[PDB]
Design a protein around this ligand. Structure first.
Ligand SMILES: *[C@@H](C)/C=N/c1c(NC[C@H](O)[C@H](O)[C@H](O)CO)[nH]c(=O)[nH]c1=O
Ligand code: NA
Lengths: 197, 260, 97, 243
């Protein structure tokens, strides 16, 4: 008696995503879909016990008791949907059997990119400064530092909802004397058309 | 053969007699029991204990312990909403019917003071209240649509699942056929008058059909209830007072004629 | 509503003075559950008398079966003594051989 | 329905005993659950709390380390007797519905981190970085960067405040913090956040920007021997509009 669902799923923002969940059991008293953002508790999404597809806004939950199968369908996908989607069913003796959960990664749709590396300066301090690799495509991925005194964060997407605008960004800083923005992201393969002031 | 699985629940407001009891039945056989004085689900038929894992009893005991608590609270609220003085009783009944022709039936009911209170319709996913007090419970139970859905499937699929399972666990007792011993004896029911008794005994299942005939026409007939003999077999009878009569009898497929 | 019991006292297999039989008393269709019942041998409570547990019928009422091992005698009289809420005086049903 | 569980964050020394309470703020719960989520693993069930019955434990769970009890019908309490750094985890409370279908209601939090020495607790230092003149020239936008650095453990919550109001539009915070010295375990962390606003917005000198970092440090009923006590506090960095 066990339940199975994918470990991870990656999809572009704005398209339908089907998280399949398949079980096998002697008894069945319904199937739950729960949503759980990193470092937070899960929140109820659905309860299907009868055969058929049931809509509840942007989300949908389908069940085939005969095929021992369910799916969570997230359409018109958003950045807020990057969460983990827990699947669990009630077996014969009313025990909830949890799945390991699918981690959903929403990659944005950067249609007008201009990869550029910039230098920022501290509000109070003078010697303090950070390099920011921003406005780069979802194709380009940022690799972490192989140096202990240089710090590089992974890409992060920010939505400027007041303008329907998104952008990937990576920050890099170091106290190292010879730390420059032109050598800051050398550990990663960056576009050949990347701007440097 | 046509079989059933049904579990009963009973709550008493002023106990002596346990406050809560629950017992299961496959056909007319008690298969499970739980009460507030044991607080443990136990088997009734040996073939249950033999076939169900120790984990089964552990898990349904915690379930039943929780169900007992819900029955306490429901009975107190019903008692107060009625401003009903004295002792009162709450009863629940849920079941199965796997008919001979493959078709099924599901039912769920509640009764306050031994009279129908809330009847569940699994096709409409609604509750049938008998009065203004039952109605305010209906309003609340009909609110949670998920529970209504959960119930329909439990009755329609899960219940039959369990029933079929039990029929295999106790096929030597439930699926057996012990044909009746039919005897006709003449005995004067009053002075002068003379009646014919069609006494039948030692049969299983308890479902039997006795009747008298007048050269072929169905007769005016006095009956005896189907009664347990105590050996796991049942007993019954039927009677009537120039014409030639016969006791036509049907039990578990086979049909008998006893011309006298 | 309170339902009064139906008392049916009878032998297992058809009785004949001499052979060993079982005397059953089947109290049924009663409501509520609290019921006290005993069997009698000319007004004497039979000490060793096994019985079924409280059983539940679909009509909401309950039923029980009290039985004893016995050998019939042409002289000895057998009865069933039931006491329930509905019975203001305790009901005695004698066995008709 | 709602379930609440206190405390939300907790730091305790190795050897002590921490108690996580859990209450269902509306309905009474006959059964409540105790879940745990080690980083990074699935949400694992560790115990089942039952009113008028004992506590059911799972595969890994040792009935000698955890002490769960059903206090009231509204309250369940998990108590970690003799804590060790291996016990440090995310502890979620759950309460099942009255109905049989089994929907659970979860309590938010609790984040417990056991430390053999409390002399390793450090609050963050926060710095804000004004947007590049070159960024505005090209993109006609202004990304602001914040930095919460040298904090331990990972008990921080970062927020942006434009002219007194908490903002979410145009914000980006690292999901995971960076180890300053990844070589050594029990290392201090660093976390960054972005605030990209319009070109003209940041050029208005009457516009105020402030990066707020909440730290969930030590209790009042915890002892300090040193350095000022790294208690629960807020550390912030400001920025003003510039033309
Ligand atoms: C052992 C299997 C005892 N079961 C039991 C049940 N079981 C039927 C079903 O699970 C339950 O009625 C649900 O509440 C249906 O929604 N029912 C019962 O009344 N008593 C029992 O002992
Ligand atoms: Na199962």
């Amino acid at each position: 008696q066990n339940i199975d669902q994918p470990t991870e799923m990656t999809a572009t923002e704005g398209a339908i995503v089907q998280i399949n969940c398949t079980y096998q059991t002697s008894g069945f008293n319904g199937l739950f879909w729960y949503q759980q953002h990193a470092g937070e508790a899960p929140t109820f999404l659905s309860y299907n016990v009868l055969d058929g597809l049931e809509e509840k806004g942007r989300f949908s939950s389908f069940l085939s008791r005969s095929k021992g199968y369910s799916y969570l369908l997230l359409k018109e996908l958003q950045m807020k949907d990057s969460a983990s989607y827990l699947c669990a069913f009630m077996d014969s003796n009313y025990q909830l059997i949890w799945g390991a959960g699918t981690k959903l990664i929403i990659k944005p749709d950067i249609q007008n990119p201009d990869p550029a590396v910039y230098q920022l300066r501290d509000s109070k301090s003078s010697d303090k400064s950070v390099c920011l690799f921003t406005d780069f495509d979802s194709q380009t991925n940022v690799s972490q530092s192989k140096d202990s005194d240089v710090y590089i964060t992974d890409k992060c997407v920010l939505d400027m909802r007041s303008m329907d605008f998104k952008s990937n960004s990576a920050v890099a800083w170091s106290n190292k004397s010879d730390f420059a923005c032109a050598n800051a992201f050398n550990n990663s393969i960056i576009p050949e058309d990347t701007f440097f002031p | 053969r046509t079989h059933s699985l049904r579990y009963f629940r009973l709550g008493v407001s002023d106990p002596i007699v346990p406050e809560f009891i629950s017992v299961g039945y496959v056909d007319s056989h008690p298969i499970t029991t739980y009460d507030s004085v044991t607080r443990q689900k136990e088997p009734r038929a040996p073939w249950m204990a033999e076939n169900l894992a120790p984990d089964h009893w552990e898990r349904y005991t915690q379930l039943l312990r929780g169900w007992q608590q819900m029955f306490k609270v429901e009975l107190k609220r019903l008692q107060r909403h009625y401003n009903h003085s004295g002792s009162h009783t709450y009863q629940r009944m849920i079941g199965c019917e796997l008919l001979e022709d493959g078709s099924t039936t599901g039912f769920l009911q509640y009764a306050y003071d031994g009279q129908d209170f809330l009847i569940f319709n699994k096709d409409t996913l609604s509750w049938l209240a008998v009065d203004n007090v039952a109605h305010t419970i209906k309003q609340a139970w009909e609110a949670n649509q998920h529970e209504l859905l959960y119930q329909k499937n439990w009755l329609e699929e899960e219940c039959i699942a369990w029933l079929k399972r039990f029929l295999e666990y106790g096929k030597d007792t439930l699926q057996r056929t012990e044909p009746p011993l039919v005897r006709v004896n003449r005995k004067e029911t009053f002075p002068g008058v003379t009646a014919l008794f069609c006494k039948a005994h030692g049969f299983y299942p308890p479902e039997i059909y006795m009747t008298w005939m007048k050269n072929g026409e169905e007769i005016e007939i006095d009956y005896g209830d189907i009664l347990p003999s105590g050996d796991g077999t049942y007993q019954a009878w039927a009677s009537i007072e120039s014409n030639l009569y016969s006791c036509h009898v049907e039990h578990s497929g086979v049909h008998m004629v006893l011309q006298v | 509503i309170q339902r009064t019991p139906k008392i049916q006292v009878y032998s297992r297999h058809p009785a004949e003075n001499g052979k060993s039989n079982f005397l059953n008393c089947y109290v049924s269709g009663f409501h509520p559950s609290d019921i006290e019942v005993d069997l009698l041998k000319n007004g004497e409570r039979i000490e060793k008398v096994e019985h079924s547990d409280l059983s539940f019928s679909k009509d909401w009422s309950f039923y029980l079966l009290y039985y004893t091992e016995f050998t019939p005698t042409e002289k000895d009289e057998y009865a069933c003594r039931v006491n329930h809420v509905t019975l203001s005086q305790p009901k005695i049903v004698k066995w008709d051989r | 329905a709602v379930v609440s569980q206190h405390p939300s964050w907790v730091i305790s020394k190795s050897g002590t005993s921490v108690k996580i309470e859990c209450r269902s703020l509306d309905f009474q719960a006959t059964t409540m659950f105790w879940y745990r989520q080690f980083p990074k693993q699935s949400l694992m069930l560790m115990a089942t709390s039952n009113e008028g019955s004992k506590a059911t434990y799972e595969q890994g769970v040792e009935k000698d380390k955890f002490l769960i009890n059903h206090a009231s019908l509204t309250l369940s309490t998990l108590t970690v007797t003799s804590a060790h750094p291996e016990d440090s985890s995310f502890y979620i409370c759950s309460a099942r519905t009255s109905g049989d279908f089994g929907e659970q209601f979860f309590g938010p939090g609790t984040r417990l981190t056991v430390l053999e020495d409390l002399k390793n607790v450090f609050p963050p230092e926060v710095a804000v970085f004004e947007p590049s003149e070159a960024e505005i020239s090209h993109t006609q936008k202004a990304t602001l960067v914040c930095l919460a650095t040298g904090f331990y453990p990972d008990h921080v919550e970062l927020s942006w405040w434009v002219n007194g109001k908490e903002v979410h539009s145009g914000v980006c915070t690292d999901p995971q913090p960076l180890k300053e010295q990844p070589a050594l375990n029990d290392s201090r962390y660093a976390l960054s956040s972005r605030l990209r606003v319009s070109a003209t917005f940041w050029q208005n000198p009457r516009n105020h920007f402030r990066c707020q970092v909440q730290f969930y440090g030590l209790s009042e009923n915890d002892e300090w021997t040193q350095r000022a006590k790294p208690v629960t506090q807020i550390v912030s960095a400001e920025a003003w509009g510039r033309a």
